[PDB]
Amino acid sequence: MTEKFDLATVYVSDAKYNRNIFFDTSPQAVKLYLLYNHWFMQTLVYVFIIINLALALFEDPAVVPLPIWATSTIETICLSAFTVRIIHYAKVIPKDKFWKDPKNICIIIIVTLSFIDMVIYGALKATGHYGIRWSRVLRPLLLVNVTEGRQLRRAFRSIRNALPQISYVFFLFMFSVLVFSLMALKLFGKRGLLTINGSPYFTDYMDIVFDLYVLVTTANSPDVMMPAYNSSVYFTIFFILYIVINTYTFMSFFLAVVYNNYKKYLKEEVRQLVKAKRIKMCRAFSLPSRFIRQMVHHRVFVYAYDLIILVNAVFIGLDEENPVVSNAEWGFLALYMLEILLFWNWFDTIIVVSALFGTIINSALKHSGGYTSRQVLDIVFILRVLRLIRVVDSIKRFRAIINTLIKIGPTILTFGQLILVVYYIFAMVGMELFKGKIQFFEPNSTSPDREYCGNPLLKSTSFAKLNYCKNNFNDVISSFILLLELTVVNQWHVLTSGFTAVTHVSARLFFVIFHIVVVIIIINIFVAFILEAFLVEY
């Protein structure tokens, strides 16, 4: 009636959410909900999470060194924003189900732990303990256990359900690796002959099992077997079997398990949100020449601009800065500018107006200071070749991608932050162990400081003399890059062998665990998506 109508609106206006609220009895206790779910607070909590995360750019290893008093008073207001949001949520939900939700317990827990760690990082006269801030790994868990993370903490239950099977299979896989390592130890071994390059080939077991594990990841496929294939071809059979048993059978059994669990949780996000919709949504019931320019387009006219684009991609990859081509970049700019004579019309318009910034080239190269020569060209040419993507219209296959790019569809946003929660936890953990062991040195630097590697323990390794030096964990920027080239598994064993040469050999576990959680059950949860999105879309 006079106020139940509003309760009805707030029950119906969520044709997408999934939760229970306080059914209004005090007329401000539903206004507090309407303010809670209000888009601006929903984006304010996310920008406050992003500030809290990106605080890692400044703190212990910093790309921008900021004083501790200054990078603590930022996450003090971040944690205060989370506290004010959680007490406001408690003012929305009655004090019956607020206390039971794990999400709320976890939120107040990680806020309390971050706030206690922040002040116990009151160093107390430089008692720096050579590594602190054990709560930075809890920062990306706000991204999950926040009230708006229903799209993520649901996608975390999908993995929580996959573990009694992923581990069920990984036990068999690690047993295969361990029995194959025993088989290879009784083969070429301490009771064997051959070497690799000044090293004994397969002599100790704990190095065999790692060299055989990394062969599953095929980071060293033709090199781990090149001795003992230089010795006898019959040794090859061992690796032929190992690869087809582990690299292809097991590493695809993990994908099968991950895809099965994803496919099984998709029908329990839907059909459990659908029932979570009709609960409330149904409860509301109980609660001249101008004619010519108009007709040229719907003709052979896109074929004229699919050729002008094509001849434009030939006027790009031939530049030697001759008047033939240095002026022609202006003509093509005008040709698309008439396309302003009425998906792509959204994208196409963005590029042409951004390409009209070739005037900046005129106003910043021949005069007015040419100090920004390479930078502005590397941003206009990366933009001209972006026009080229619309030449794909000639195949009639990109007006049908905005459906595969369906409206915003936070699924690709959910994974985009799922890879962040994992990277941030490993970057934070990683950069406290290998904080400043190796370091990229400028090409003209103090060579007597051992500039060819960073520190003499990489005196002659395959990490040095391969220019891997900007892969250090010395800051969250160059530590997120490293975790990429660790994700894409090429030569992850030599990146590992550069961090187990400056630290103990046990650091091998940090990168093995990383590969297990990222490449086996995070990249596969990605392939499981663009597999599911491809088959069941009809």
Contact 477, 470 (CB under 8 A): no
**Cα–Cα distance, 106 to 97 (Å, whole number):** 14
Q: Is 222 in the site for its own copies (CB under 8 A)?
A: yes
**Cα–Cα distance, 306 to 394 (Å, whole number):** 7
SS3 state of residue 399: coil
Residues 371-390 that bind Na ion (CB under 5 A): none
Q: Is 268 in the site for its own copies (CB under 8 A)?
A: no
Find which of Na ion, its own copies, none residue 526 binds, CB within 5 to 8 Å per kind: its own copies
x/- mask, its own copies, residues 194-213, rule CB under 8 A, reads ---x-------x--------
Q: How many other C-beta atoms lie within 10 A of the C-beta of residue 431?
A: 24
Contact 499, 511 (CB under 8 A): yes
**Cα–Cα distance, 294 to 532 (Å, whole number):** 43
Nearer to its own copies, 262 or 510 (CB): 262
CB of 304 to its own copies, least distance (A): 20
Q: Is 71 in the site for its own copies (CB under 8 A)?
A: no
Q: Which residue from 431, 438, 464, 523 is in contact with its own copies, where contact means CB under 8 A?
A: 523
CA nearest neighbour of 474 among 455, 448, 490: 455
What tokens does 470 get?
Answer: 């900007």
Contact 115, 133 (CB under 8 A): no
**Cα–Cα distance, 208 to 231 (Å, whole number):** 18
Q: Which residue from 66, 109, 226, 365 is in contact with its own copies, where contact means CB under 8 A?
A: 226
x/- mask, Na ion, residues 441-480, rule CB under 5 A, reads ----------------------------------------
Q: Is 525 in the site for its own copies (CB under 8 A)?
A: no
Distance of CA 253 to the CA centre of its chain: 24
Q: Is 490 in the site for Na ion (CB under 5 A)?
A: yes
CA nearest neighbour of 525 among 186, 159, 266, 229: 159
Q: Which residue from 7, 155, 219, 502 is in contact with its own copies, where contact means CB under 8 A?
A: 219
x/- mask, its own copies, residues 312-331, rule CB under 8 A, reads -x--xx-x-x----------
| Binding region for its own copies (CB under 8 A) out of 97-105, 125-133, 309-317, 361-369 | 309-317
x/- mask, its own copies, residues 450-489, rule CB under 8 A, reads ----------------xxxxxx-----xx--x--xx--xx
CB of 275 to its own copies, least distance (A): 24
CA atoms within 13 A of residue 510's CA, in its CB half-sphere: 25
Q: How many other C-beta atoms lie within 10 A of the C-beta of residue 489?
A: 17
Q: Is 248 in the site for Na ion (CB under 5 A)?
A: no
Count of chain residues binding its own copies (CB under 8 A): 77
Q: Which residue from 223, 306, 339, 451 is in contact with its own copies, where contact means CB under 8 A?
A: 223
CB of 472 to Na ion, least distance (A): 22
Nearer to its own copies, 109 or 477 (CB): 477
Q: Which residue from 100, 125, 397, 407 is in contact with its own copies, where contact means CB under 8 A?
A: 397
Q: Is 191 in the site for its own copies (CB under 8 A)?
A: yes
Q: Enumerate the β-bridge partners of residue 200.
A: 195
Q: Is 531 in the site for its own copies (CB under 8 A)?
A: yes
Burial label for 146, CB within 10 Å (0-12, 13-18, 19+), is buried
Q: Is 50 in the site for its own copies (CB under 8 A)?
A: no
**Cα–Cα distance, 429 to 498 (Å, whole number):** 17
SS3 state of residue 195: strand
CB of 430 to its own copies, least distance (A): 16
| Binding region for its own copies (CB under 8 A) out of 4-12, 146-154, 178-186, 293-301 | 178-186
Contacts of 95 (CB under 8 A, 6+ apart): none
Q: List phi, psi (to 5°) of 399.
A: -85, -15
* Residues at the interface with Na ion (CB under 5 A): 490
